[PDB]
């Protein structure tokens, strides 16, 4: 009688205890849902982490700039759940950006086979995932994926800002596509979250000053959020994808849902 | 065992049962929602509408123009739950504009004491409502509002539209006011619903050409929308509308959700 | 051989020195265009600000909530400057808020009755008097109103906000009936400068920690503006909105142009 | 005395005279400015092309796709223009996507290579010529780049939409980082204007039911348009790139203007 009671969710971006997506399958799961999930290049330590979760799951290896993996992916999924057994929900959690083109580098200095590489990780692989997953998903279903408002410029983030602008805009085509075969597709627009990587920042490993900084656009980000912002509970966040994979959401598509406490809303 | 299991909700804006706000009430009846019901001047009318839902529920009267209606309101739902039951979301399905700031009339020739009243029913009222019933909500409650997707100057709607640009800024500050509470505010867009009201309109209220016209508009929605839009069902803006008054989008506040079938993230 | 070489403008919104529309005026004439000038109220303190500027300039009383300043202004005009002369461009540079919607009172607390005059001079006026003042427009002619950018919620400014989110609205259904006579309808959205009243602010009639507060809004604004913000210095917003007075934007109406240092466009 | 009078502007785009930046230049020229030309590939076409101009301009080879190029264009500009003169407006007026990402081909079709190569093209190269023609720029320039406008999906345009929503995305970056040099960075978003390219999709380069809808499309832009929209006429653009690269817009920066007709800001 959950939330997600029956439905089969295939679930990217496991690669810690602290990714996103770790909480997706987390809530998920304990929203009654059956999970495939899937990892990139460290599969001994995904599988690790994985074991970790309420309940087993599959896990298949995925590179998203590998057109074999894409190709076989949904036979592959297919086999986890069953000939004939269709996914109802994708949640897309995967970002990449080359340090040359988010940090401390200059802006102009990225080459563009760094940022090439970051936005095909971090938008493109939006739609080669959806084209992968579609021919296998049934109707009514839903494909989440995972953004960080980019719609000003900030400092740092940089060339990861161009990637998620341009994810928004392959969300809408993707919405389109998916939508002749009734599947929905939208992307949650998350606040700071307390990853490892994260926390490295926080612990210098990009320069000091720069923790002391981010520590207090965290402190800004709590400060306009007017219920507040938790960058170390990852809850609401997971919470708000299983909202869009469950059936209570069934006109919405080709948009961001902003779970950011409100932040993005406030000038100050 | 359902989405709003004992959750106690406000409902505004019953006059038919083609009003999006008694498609609300008995969607979030059947998700488990006690009501408390507010209907505005035929009051016996609205009562024979809500003997129809799912559920019985009590109805409060409730002008939002009414100073008196609003300073008592708190007491008065008090009264029908009981001074120690608090609300857990509060719906606001209300709007009007007179016939000189919306329909066939020229845009420079309504005069503003009708825009005024316009934009104090139609947005001023989702403020006055909030600050009506915020007293006795409980944290983490929900409000909700219904609004209709203004960001585009459009043929007919005239002043509504600039009514509901108002109501998206109103719920911003909403938002703000009710984060110190624990309780978020946002809206939901739908697309065109078929009331009683919009069928006057393609049965020709307002000239046979605008009926065409008006015809042809919901068929471009239905194209425009990825996965389509059916305006004879309110259905899915209902339970989105739910999906906000449920706990699974906990940090989002001062937004809008689109209910629309996607139409506004198409271009054409 | 200037930019507004040999145009006819009327002015709105004088009231001081430091007033954007006296700055608006003075770049105006330096720039070659003739003016008529209007104003609101202190008719003999407005007529002693405008012999200020660097060129005469006819005045005429106009209070935009007085229907009949309205009724006549197009005969006033006329009669100013010929009935076989057309007005080439037309400045709205009127705002209004009483203190009970903009300040330090909280933001519920507003009554309607306040609102609905904020948003009648602040918002209504600006489809009023583009109403009054068309019949009178050559073609190609435009528009022009000024915006604070409402975008999203922020302290202080509270139902100013959404006085500003409806201006918005009605620009853009202004924009579509002026369209019809060959004129373009567009506001500029400039940063904070300081008037007389904002210096009131700094200067404490709002309270000791608002001032400072102020102070230091000012300070990130000019932050976050790549190219840096002077709140002292109107004449950048002047500058724009001549530049959307010349012929050099022939195709652009509905829409906003940002003077404000590019802040808008950053986080932070 | 004109309005880009004594003005050295680096114009990049030109490939026909039905160009943007054809036009661009022209207007410019037109305007009493100074002009550096850029081509890519068709050196001798492009050249022929440019002594159309009202008046003769050195002409650089530019691949924007070139390091070499890149690292070497202020040098050559430098001395084309004197090694002591610096630009004052730099024109972007480039893009490129492969059939495969733009056209007939469905969108989950598009192999990142060619989406990678349009992007590089269209959105990262506005990054890497603000970089390469910065060093030699006075303060108070002007970098305008072109664009259409990307925020909803649309048939056909596919993946150069992203593109579109990458360059936006740069130009807010660009805009900051010009920011420190006093240089403005903005983007015009025109609406459709016929190339060669444009006429060859009327002519059924694509197919003719797509002739008919895209005749079609520019039918609806011109209806939604409040002052109309010619798509045989570019000079509406070419007059607003200029008025961008004048000193009246000063403070603007990381914005987008329409010259759009202000079909973008009407729904129909
Ligand atoms: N952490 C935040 O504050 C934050 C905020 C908003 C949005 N987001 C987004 O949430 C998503 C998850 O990031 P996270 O913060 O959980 O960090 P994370 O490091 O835990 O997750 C990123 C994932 O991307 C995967 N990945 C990288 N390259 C890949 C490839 N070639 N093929 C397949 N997978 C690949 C990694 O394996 C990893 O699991 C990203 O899209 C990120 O941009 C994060
Ligand atoms: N119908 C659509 O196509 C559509 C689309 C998008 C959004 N909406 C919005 O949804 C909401 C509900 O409208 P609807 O379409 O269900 O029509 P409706 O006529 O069924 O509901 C509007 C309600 O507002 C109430 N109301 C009017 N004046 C009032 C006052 N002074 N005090 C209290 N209540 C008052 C009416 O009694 C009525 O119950 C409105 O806000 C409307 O703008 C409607
Ligand atoms: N000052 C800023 O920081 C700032 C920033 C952005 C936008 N703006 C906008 O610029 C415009 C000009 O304001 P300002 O800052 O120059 O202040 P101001 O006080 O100098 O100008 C406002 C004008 O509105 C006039 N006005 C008020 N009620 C009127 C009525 N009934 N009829 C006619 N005119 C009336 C006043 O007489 C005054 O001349 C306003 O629209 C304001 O909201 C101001
Ligand atoms: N034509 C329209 O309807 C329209 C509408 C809005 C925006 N735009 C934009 O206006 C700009 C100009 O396009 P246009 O319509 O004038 O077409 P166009 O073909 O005349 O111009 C595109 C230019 O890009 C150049 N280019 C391509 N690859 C290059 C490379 N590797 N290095 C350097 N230059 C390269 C070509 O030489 C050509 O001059 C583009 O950015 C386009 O997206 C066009
Ligand atoms: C300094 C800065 C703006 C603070 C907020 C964070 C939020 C954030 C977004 C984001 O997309 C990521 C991310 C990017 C790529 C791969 C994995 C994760 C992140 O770590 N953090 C981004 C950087
Ligand atoms: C011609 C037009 C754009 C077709 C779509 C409709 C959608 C719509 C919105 C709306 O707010 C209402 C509404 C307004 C006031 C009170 C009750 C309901 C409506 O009836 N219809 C609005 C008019
Ligand atoms: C605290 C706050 C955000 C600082 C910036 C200012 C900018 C501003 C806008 C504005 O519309 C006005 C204004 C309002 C009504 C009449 C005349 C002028 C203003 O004074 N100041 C608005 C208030
Ligand atoms: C079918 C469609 C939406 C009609 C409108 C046009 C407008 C348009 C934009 C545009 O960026 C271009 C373009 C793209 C790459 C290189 C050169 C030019 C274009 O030709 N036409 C784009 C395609
Ligand atoms: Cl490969
Ligand atoms: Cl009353
Ligand atoms: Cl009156
Ligand atoms: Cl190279
Ligand atoms: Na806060
Ligand atoms: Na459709
Ligand atoms: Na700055
Ligand atoms: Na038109």
Redesign the interface.
């Known amino acids: ?1 959950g ?1 997600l009671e029956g439905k089969r969710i295939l679930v990217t971006g496991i690669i810690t205890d602290s990714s996103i997506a770790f909480h997706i399958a987390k809530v998920a799961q304990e929203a009654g849902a059956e999970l495939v999930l899937t990892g990139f290049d460290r599969m001994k330590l995904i599988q690790r982490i994985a074991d970790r979760l309420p309940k087993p799951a599959p896990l298949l290896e995925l590179d998203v700039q590998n057109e074999e993996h894409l190709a076989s992916l949904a036979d592959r999924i297919s086999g986890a759940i069953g000939e004939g057994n269709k996914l109802d929900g994708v949640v897309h959690s995967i970002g990449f950006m080359p340090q040359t083109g988010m940090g401390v580098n ?3 200095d990225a080459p ?1 086979a760094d ?2 590489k970051g ?2 990780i971090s ?2 692989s939006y ?2 995932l ?2 992968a997953t579609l021919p296998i998903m049934n109707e009514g279903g839903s494909i989440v994926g995972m953004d960080f408002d ?6 740092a983030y ?1 060339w990861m ?2 990637a ?3 994810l ?3 969300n ?9 075969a ?3 597709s939208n992307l949650v627009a998350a ?1 700071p979250i307390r990853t490892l990587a994260m926390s490295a920042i926080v612990g210098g490993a990009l320069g000091d000053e720069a923790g002391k900084q981010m520590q207090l ?1 965290e402190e ?1 980000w709590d400060q306009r ?5 938790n960058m170390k509970d990852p809850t ?2 997971a ?2 994808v ?2 869009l994979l ?10 961001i ?6 932040a ?5």
Chains 1, 2, 3, 4 share one sequence.
């Not at 959020?225 to 912002?229: L, Q």
């Open positions: 009688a939330l200059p802006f102009f563009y940022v090439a936005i095909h938008a493109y739609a080669s959806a084209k980019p719609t000003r410029a900030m400092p940089n800002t161009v998620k602008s341009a928004e805009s392959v809408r085509f993707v919405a389109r596509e998916a939508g002749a009734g599947v929905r606040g656009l800004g959020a007017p219920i507040g912002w609401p966040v919470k708000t299983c909202a469950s059936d209570w959401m069934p006109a919405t598509t080709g948009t849902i902003y779970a950011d406490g409100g993005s809303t406030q000038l100050l």
